[PDB]
Structure formats: C-alpha cells, structure tokens
Point group: C2
C-alpha cells in the first residue's frame, strides 16, 4: 500500500487485523529476562511471579482470545485496562481507531467528552456493512491508502471484552505523555477495589509507552517496599522493551521533555507508594503536598461579577411565545434544520417566556408583561449552577474560570455555597465588576454592599414562584438535570407559566425552552421548534462552529448540544404518548 | 515583503534593523501598571522601586544606545544579560541570527559548543562586504524574502556591547523552555558576584518568554521574603505582558507542557529563594534534595569495560613514522586538504608512533619494534582521562556514558580515582565486559581479579618511560591539555621517541600526533600533515559528518576538531620561531 499524500485531520484506520495469535509486544509479569542491563548485572526477580499481570499492544478480537487462553485465569478474573485516549472500537473483530498526527485524535479533550464522542463515531458506522478504511504503517506512523472492509458488528472495546466474560476499565490517556494526577487517582481507586485474585492486562496502541508506565506502576504497587526503584525499572525493560530511565540522543526539544517527565513521574509514584503503603491519602493530594503535582485548571470563583445593573426595563433577550420574530437574523449562527418560517403552532397554548438574568428593576418591569399574558401560576426557572444573587438590587454572581465555579457540586452543595457567600458579603466593601470580552474586570472599584438576597427571595417577595436547576454554563444540560425538569412538569399547577433564564438567556435558557416546547408539541418538527426558539430570541440549539480555531474551547460542547438536542426530540417522540413514564435517563440506556 | 516557500534548515536573517529608539517591549521594574488583574485587585508595588532592572527584545546597536542613554546609570554599571541560546551577532549596527524552525538553531547544544560555534559563524561573514540576508515576520515567526545588506564590521553581542562601555553576560537558553538547573546555578553565581549598584537588563528575542522568566526570578531574588509569589507573578504581568500563571486554551500537547513547566519552575525558584535567603546552597543541590530538580545525564562510570584482551601481537592501529601508508584508504573519511600523496619531509626523524590501548602481551610485541627504530629514550604518552588499568594482563577501563567517567576532574583527581578503583577491585570477583555497538555488555560473566596494576606500573616495569595527559574522550584536547603537552616536549631529551595512545588509537591519538608533527615541521602544510597522519594509520583530524542524523551527537565535536586543528597550525606558524614563548592558551586569548 502507498502512503496517503493528503491525509485528512482525522482518519479512520485499521489498528489490528483479526488474527489468531498473541498480540504484538505481549508479555507477562513472570516472563524471563531477555537481554542485559548496562552493568551486566541482572536485577532481582523478587515479587515478579505473583504480580498477576500481562501487557501488550492493542488487540483484535481473535488476539484477545489468545490472551484469555494463555493467561492462567478465567475471564471473570481478567481485567482489560484500556489506556488509549484516542477513539477506537471494533468492526467485527478488526480493531480500528480515528488517527490524527502523533496519535492525538482527542488532544486536550476530557474524559466526559471523549467517551461520548467515541460512542458517536462508532455509532456513525452502524447501519452499514461496508466502509472505506485507511491502512496504517507502524514504523513510520503514517496512514496508508484505504481498502473496503465488510462487517456487521460495531462494538466499543468494552462491549467486545465483556462479551468474552472478562472485565473492562478505561483511562483516556493522550499518547506520548505521563498520566495526570487525576487519572492516577482514578486508576488507584479502581485498583484498590479489585478482588485480590484479579489479573490486570495493560495495553495502549503499540504496547510500549503508556503501557510501560503502567507496568512499572503495577510493579511499584506490588513490590516497592521490597525492591528498589532502579531494579523495578530495569526488570520491566528486560521483560518488555522500554527502559524508562533512558533519554536517547534521538530525542530532542519537545519529545525529550516528555521522556524526562514520564521518567520523573514513575519516580514520584514510587516515592508515593513507599511513603503510603495503605494508599489511603490520594496520589494527587500527596503530590500536591510535596510539590510534585501535575497542573490542573482551577474553576473556583475568584470575583463577584455584575451580571446586570439595576435598571427599569425588561432584561436582555427577553421574549414570550407571543413575541414577534427577530429582525437581526443571521443564518451563520443557525444550523441543521433552520427555516426562516417555522409553523408557530401551539405557541399560544405554550405558556413560556425566557431572558437573561435580571436585577430588581428588570423584574418589576417583567411582572406587568407576564401578568397580562399568563393564565396561571407564574414560575421563574433559574437554570444557573453558578452561585448568584442580588447585591443592592443588582444581579451578581461568583465567577470562576469559564463560569464554572460550582462544577461538580450537587444541588444542595450549590445552595449551601450560594447562601454562604452571599451572606459573607453582606455589609463588606467588595469589588463587583462587569467583565469585558476577555473576562477581565472593567474599571473595578470596591463598593459597600448594603443589601443582599438570593434570587429566590427577590422572586417570592414579588409574588412569583421559583424553581432552581443547577445546570453548568456552556454545556448540554445533564441527564439528572433534564429529568429534574420533566419531573417538575408532572406536578406543576394547571396553567403554569414558565419563565426560563440563565446568565445571558442564550445557552441553557434556550435549550430548556426548546425541550419544553417539544414536550408540549410533539407534532411540530425538530427543525421548526429550534427555528422558532431562535427566531423568538434565543440562539440556535443545534449551532456548531464552522472552522474550529485553536482557542475555541466551546467547539466540542456545541457539537455535544447539536447531537443531544436531536436525541431529546426522539425521546419525546417515543415517550410523550405514555406521558413520559420512561424517564430520559432510563431511555438513554438504549 | 513575502514569505519563503522553502527556507534552508538554518537561515541567516535580520533580527533588528538599526534604528534610533528604545527596542520593543522595553520596560523597567519601576514602570507603572498597565491593565488589571483578573480579581480586579492590584498587587503591592513593594520593592519594585529599587530593583534596578530593565528588559526588552533583542536590540540593534542604536537601540542599545537609546537604552544606555535612558537608564539611570553609566555604561560601567550596566549589565546586558543575553539569554539567547540561538547564534546571533551584528553586521555593523544590525542584529542578525541564524534561525531554524521554532528558533532552535542550536537545539540541544551545550554552552561549550555554542559560544565558539557562534564565533565561527560570525567569522565566516568577515571578509565579505555584501550579504543577502532573509527578512523575518515577528508576528508569525517565518522567514521572509531576502534583502542585500552591506557592512564593514562583524561583531558578537559581547564585542558590540563592551565597545559602548557596558558589561555582558550570556546564558545560552533554548527558546520556549525554562532554564535548566545548571543554568540557574550559573546565573546565581553571576548575580552573587555583582557590585550593588549594578543595572541588569534582560533580553531574549521578543522580550517575553525567556525574558519574563528572568524578570520574575529577579523580582523573587529582591523581594521574595516581602512579596507573595502570586503578587510578583501578577505585578510582572502589569509592567510586562506575559502572565506566567496563565495556561491558554490555544496551547496544546507539547506547547502546553512547556508553559506549565516554566510556571512550576518559577514556583520552585520562589521556594528556594524563600528558604535560602543567603543563596548558600546551590539551586541544583537544593532542587535535587527536594526532588524538583531538572534532569541531567550521569556520565559516571558504572561497568569495567574490557578494552583489549591480553594477546601477543602489535596493538590495534599500531604505527610508526617509518610505516607504510594504508591500503584501505577511504576518501569519505577524509576532509579539507586530503592529498593522497603528502610529503615525507621530517618524518624519518620525528620519532613518533601511536596505537590503541594495549594489554601486557601487546606491549611486549611493541618493545622490539620500538627499541629497534628508536635513537633515544621511549615515552609512552597515555592520553586517557578515563580511569583505566590492567586486570590479569588485560587492559580495562571504568566506563561511564560516552566514556566520560572522569569528566570535569583535574589530573590529580583522575589519578586519585584511578588508584582507588583499580586497587579496590583487586582480589574481588566482578564483571569485565566487552561492549557492543550500543555500548551494552556482550555475554557479561563475573571474573576473579588476581593481578591488578596501572598502565604506569606496566610500562615502567618494562623499562619505558610514562607520561599522562587526561584528555577527555571524543573531543578536541583542552587548551590546558595541549599546553601540558608543549611543556613536556620542552623538557624532554632531544632524541626522545613518543608513543601516543588512547583507547582506540584514533581520536585523541591522531590529534596529538598531528600536533607534534606540526611543531617539529612548521614547513609542511596542514593538509600534508593531516593526510600523512591519516595514511599512516590514524584518522583524518579534520573529518566532519556529511548528513548528520539526530542520534549522532558526535557531529558537533568533529566539527570542533576540524576547526581547532587549523587554529593550532596558525599557532605553530606564528610561534615556532622563539620556541613557543607564548603558550597555546595565551595565544588562543586574542
């Protein structure tokens, strides 16, 4: 096969053809030493025979059978530890994956985006039994001219391994680098919970880098108290093929730094198991305490942001289902299915409005407009996970990088944080600033906080009702959050009017309005729903970034929304009849 | 101007046209804040007043004048701290440099190779008066279309600066990376040695990256006990541009790691200054102690290598100045001036021979041949810096990476180490192995060491005289080692026969034989001497690698030999008259 001259950014290619044999670089913790150390003295073998571990490059289905046959245990005691962060899966028994230069197909992505993206990429292959798939050169690490592959099974590595009665565990590690502290913590949690008779098999693509890191971690976990670090490093070289302490002249600049960083990492890991036999205190906490921690971003709040100043007029992006379509249309900000002329039916019976956050004056201005249109209990649906409130009549919020100050907290932890911080601000002199295009404060100056109340106190004091859903800014609403919404609609009053809002009244606000709209009008088309919600004043829920520039971190999140809003529409179609007896979370299990 | 579609690997380009003005990104530790921090809160300015520091991008000669005229001190209290590792210089008042992708013109070179390489690169321009010099786009860091530059003077940044009465200090740092621990030590030593009214000006190419790192170090050094780490990081951004704590979304994989590594480095530097206000413990020592040290190779010996087995025959590459030229001559192994038919003038009376190391048996076979051609006392000149000796009749050495086991040691320390290790091995049983092409031991098996002696004891026991020069393997002999040799020849008998040897009989051996040949025969040209010495069985001293692969670390050292051998020649021509009154070191300094 010839080398592809103009390879695409991301190309699906063959990893391993289905062959009956042990996979490349297969090896066991009890194998004999091959070759010699630089001194010519063999390192001790102490503890090697009882580690119950193997490792290899990635494997085709038939190669996995050979492994299961070969290892001295039953599939139920076998755990496949999948270390690849790049997207991969199986066409029948053939292993495949999406390749980008340096095997950085999912470069910079987090696990919560990688696992779902991969599921989708594999899903896009189902429903066909023939596909053009590039070939690959292992030594030159480049893609080669394609060949058609016939198949009738598309599986993730987990589905495939489970179907042979074995276990599975994934880590989405970028090729060429040591794992970050959070992944080490995730791995140690998995390892601490295993049955004492478990057999771990590590693999990545080639079977050397990442896999050697983990074979050394395993060895350290089993024998650090009895064997030295240098002996562990050398014996893993002798039964595998990589010596982690080796920094070759071949490696320069960037590459060289990654080799050094991975070698220092296993040294820190060694020192960790050595000073913490019980693995009680987390690796990340230990590393942090000893200043050898890896870097992670911090999303915690650091500044009171002014969301909107008290003024007497409607809030930004305000709209009702009885509002006129917009004038400032821009098709470049729309997406799949946007017609400039949606049906607009069911809208008058849809008692729903939406807007950006509101201050005290903006809320006064809304009451008359809503009272005149409403025909039942009016609810303000606050969709903000971030801590926010009211300072001297102005809407403020505790802002952290990416507005993710409460990421990871449950609803109750959010409320406790919210009540706590707002209170701690009462009466003090604090900076409350508006943020510019780059999120830096504008002409910040301290100000005395006279009054402080939650948005709920402000809403109820004005005779409206209130319901909080702590949805994270910039992302598709979580499964639990969408269900908390559907549940709420089960028991809500008769002709309840729902006014949705987040920080700007675009992202979360429009996604929920669109979903509510679909629930009440399963006769309208997904395209019409999304189009009307955008024409009214929200954004286009299915919008995607055309040409993703480097600094556009939202790209994958927009894509995730585009995909899930359509999955929601299909949930409404198959479950509204029942009255949604099947919850969205349950339905997702299909 | 326009971008070049295919620039040469290394391309000479313009850094700064000569203009009368402050250089870009010029700033002073006393400047005022511009912009805000993310919290809206400004960091204290404590100590920023008395740092006596400035920074900027690289500058043209006129821009240096603008700086000197601008700072509040006289040229004599001014220190230009040049952080550029890339080769740079001046054509008249215009700054120029040799550019390679990512500005890694000298990627992986040590300061010992760089400073002289740069001097030779700049010298290569001397003589000519016109040069087509590529232009350069700062915003995209790409080589643009060439212009014709006319100059009458070529200078190093050091020569240009001192001519303006200022002081100069260089650190050869690679762009994009934090400084390594040994470079930090070298900086701390420079720093500790300064008068207290010194003005330090830092610059790299753009005035950011490397420069920001040292602006932050400088601040830390002057105010660590009074200002927090976070404040120094923020206030340095307010007067400069770059915020070191910022890891931007646009930085991925390799790039992102570098940003992180530099930010962690200034944090460790901060802890170090905090804990060592007196800067007594070197940074590297402290870093190793705390396990936050940067990685460096270990050249220490670790295995007894079998240099040459006790056999009865002349040693490898044996040869005399009465010998017959080689039959297997290879021109790909020669170089500038290789006549395949060089003179013979002054040879029959040079009284010189050479060869690889030798064991007991090979010395024996050598005596008869020498004692027959020698018309005076025979001296064995052992040119090995590495610790070696004789085990059970076999020539062995204590081999460390690159055979640099005694790197950085003086003659006395080398002999002390040699006696210690050789004696320590007597009686014991251990590995003495021969090495393969990868320097790994071939079939390592322990052996009992019955007898042990130094090469000196072996030589003197056989009635020959012994002299030792500790020359480092693979490189051009040091100025001190060359002078130690000249001095020896001035005190030896006029009929003395010198037999040089190293471990292979090629590198060090031929360079010294060639230098001696030139000293006795100032009449014959370099080419004759070098070819003559190659034909006789040595190697070509001016040999260079044609298409050097990334794994051939020796390329730059061969280049250095080819350059210094010619310089030595010019030393003879100008000093053979008075009998070398001025030493090679003294001359070199000119």
């Amino acid at each position: 096969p010839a080398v592809v001259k103009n390879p695409p950014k991301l190309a699906l290619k063959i990893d391993r053809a289905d062959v009956n044999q042990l996979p490349r670089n297969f090896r066991m913790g009890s194998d004999k030493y091959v070759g010699v150390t630089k001194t010519g003295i063999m390192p001790t073998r102490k503890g090697m025979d009882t580690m119950n571990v193997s490792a290899s490059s990635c494997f085709s289905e038939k190669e996995l059978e050979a492994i299961l046959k070969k290892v001295p245990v039953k599939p139920s005691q076998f755990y496949d530890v999948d270390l690849r962060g790049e997207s991969h899966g199986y066409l029948n028994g053939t292993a495949v994956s999406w390749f980008a230069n340096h095997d950085w197909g999912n470069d910079g992505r987090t696990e919560d985006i990688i696992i779902p993206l991969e599921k989708e990429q594999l899903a896009s292959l189902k429903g066909s039994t023939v596909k053009s798939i590039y070939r690959f050169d292992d030594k030159k690490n480049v893609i080669l001219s394609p060949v058609y592959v016939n198949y009738n099974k598309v599986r993730t590595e987990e589905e495939m391994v489970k179907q042979h009665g074995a276990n599975y565990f994934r880590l989405t590690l970028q090729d060429h680098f040591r794992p970050d502290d959070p992944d080490v913590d995730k791995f140690l949690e998995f390892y601490k919970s295993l049955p004492k008779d478990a057999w771990l098999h590590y693999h990545c693509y080639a079977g050397m880098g990442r896999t050697t890191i983990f074979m050394v971690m395993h060895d350290i976990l089993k024998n650090a108290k009895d064997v030295s670090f240098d002996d562990i490093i050398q014996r893993q070289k002798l039964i595998g093929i990589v010596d982690l302490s080796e920094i070759p002249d071949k490696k320069k600049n960037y590459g060289r730094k990654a080799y050094i960083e991975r070698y220092q990492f296993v040294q820190h890991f060694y020192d960790y198991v050595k000073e913490n036999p019980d693995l009680k205190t987390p690796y990340s906490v230990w590393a942090k305490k000893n200043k050898v921690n890896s870097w992670e971003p911090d999303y915690n709040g650091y500044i009171w942001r002014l969301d909107t100043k008290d003024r007497n007029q409607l809030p930004r992006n305000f709209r009702t289902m009885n509002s006129a379509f917009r004038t400032d249309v821009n098709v470049k900000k729309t997406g799949k299915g946007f017609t400039p002329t949606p049906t607009r039916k069911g809208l008058d019976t849809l008692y729903m409005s939406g807007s950006a956050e509101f201050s005290n004056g903006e809320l006064q201005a809304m009451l008359p407009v809503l009272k005149q249109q409403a025909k039942g209990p009016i609810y303000i649906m606050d969709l903000r996970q971030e801590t926010h409130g009211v300072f001297n009549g102005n809407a403020v919020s505790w802002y952290g990088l990416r507005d993710w100050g409460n990421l990871g907290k449950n609803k109750a932890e959010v409320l406790k944080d919210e009540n706590s911080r707002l209170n701690a601000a009462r009466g003090k002199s604090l900076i409350v600033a508006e943020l510019d295009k780059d999120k830096m404060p504008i002409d910040p100056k301290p100000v005395k906080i006279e009054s402080v109340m939650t948005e709920q106190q402000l809403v109820e004091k004005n005779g409206l009702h209130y319901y909080r859903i702590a949805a994270t800014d910039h992302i598709w609403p979580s499964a639990a959050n969408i269900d908390e919404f559907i549940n709420f609609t089960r028991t809500m009053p008769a002709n309840a009017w729902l006014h949705f809002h987040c920080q700007a009244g675009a992202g979360r606000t429009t996604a929920y309005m669109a979903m509510y709209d679909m629930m009440k009008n399963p006769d309208v088309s997904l395209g019409d729903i999304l189009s009307r919600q955008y024409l009214l004043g929200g954004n286009y829920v299915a919008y995607e970034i055309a040409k993703p520039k480097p600094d556009q971190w939202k790209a994958d999140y927009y894509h995730q929304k585009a995909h899930m809003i359509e999955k929601f529409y299909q949930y409404v179609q198959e479950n509204h009849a029942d009255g949604f007896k099947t919850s969205w979370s349950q339905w997702l299990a299909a």
